[PDB]
Amino acid sequence: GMSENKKKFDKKGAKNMDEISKTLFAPIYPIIAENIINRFGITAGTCIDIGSGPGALSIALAKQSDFSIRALDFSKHMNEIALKNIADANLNDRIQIVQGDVHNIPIEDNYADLIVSRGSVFFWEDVATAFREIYRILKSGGKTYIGGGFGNKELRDSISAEMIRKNPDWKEFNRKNISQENVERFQNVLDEIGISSYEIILGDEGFWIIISKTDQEVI
């Protein structure tokens, strides 16, 4: 017997993500990057983009800041595309592609000034372990922006209409992702870890987990 197989984040899936990233979703990346810059005022140092995929968020951040960026993704197929995209954009000097998993990040302790992630958290198995790793690699005084969304209401609404036409079931998955179910879920995850300082936000720009590493309250 034989089979032809399709699974998430494989070569075919990476191509689909890349195509959408370059077309329908393209405008969201500069907006999200701008939102991140404006929110925290971090414009240099080290930034880790977790679940970077075809690399569009990293590329947008590079174009608006002076960060040294590492784009971490567990899919070889995503990383092959991201490498090409980064090179095409003349950003090889700005963004390093790192093959690896959020559950065992190949980065030293206390390294990152900023950790960002779009559209990955909703897929992670073992989120407690993932968030312990995220906290481990975050520098004291560092910030995160981990979640999903479209940057602003106008883009959210226009893109959603098109996504629903293409992929009707996306409507319900997106509705589950960008909601209070995840605010509750992730509050509970961070609380089990014992994180002293965070915000989890939900609004027109999306759903985002914003951890601040600070000297802890229990001493």
Ligand X SMILES: C[S@@+](CC[C@H](N)C(=O)[O-])C[C@H]1O[C@@H](n2cnc3c(N)ncnc32)[C@H](O)[C@@H]1O
Residues at the binding site are 29, 73-74, 101-102, 118, 120
Where does residue 77 rank: exposed (0-12), middle (13-18), buried (19+ CB within 10 A)?
Answer: middle
Interface residue with ligand X, options 33, 60, 69, 73 (CB under 6 A) = 73
- Total of residues contacting ligand X (CB under 6 A): 21
Residue 137 touches ligand X, criterion: CB under 6 A: no
Interface residue with ligand X, options 35, 48, 51, 190 (CB under 6 A) = 51
From start to end of 51-132, where are the E strands?
A: 66-73, 95-99, 112-118
Binding residues for S-adenosyl-L-methionine: 29, 73-74, 101-102, 118, 120
Residues paired with residue 107 on neighbouring β-strands, in sequence order: none
| The pair of three-digit structure tokens given for residue 156, joined into one six-digit string | 């959210």
Residue 174 touches ligand X, criterion: CB under 6 A: no
- Directed axis angle between helix 127-137 and helix 180-193, to 10°? 60
State the virtual CA torsion across 119, 46, 83, 167 in degrees, nearest 10: 10
Q: Judged by CB, which is closer to ligand X: 1, or 81?
A: 81
Q: Judged by CB, which is closer to ligand X: 36, or 102?
A: 102
Residues lying near ligand X in the complex (CB under 6 A)? 9, 17, 21, 51-53, 56-57, 72-75, 78, 101-103, 118-120, 123-124
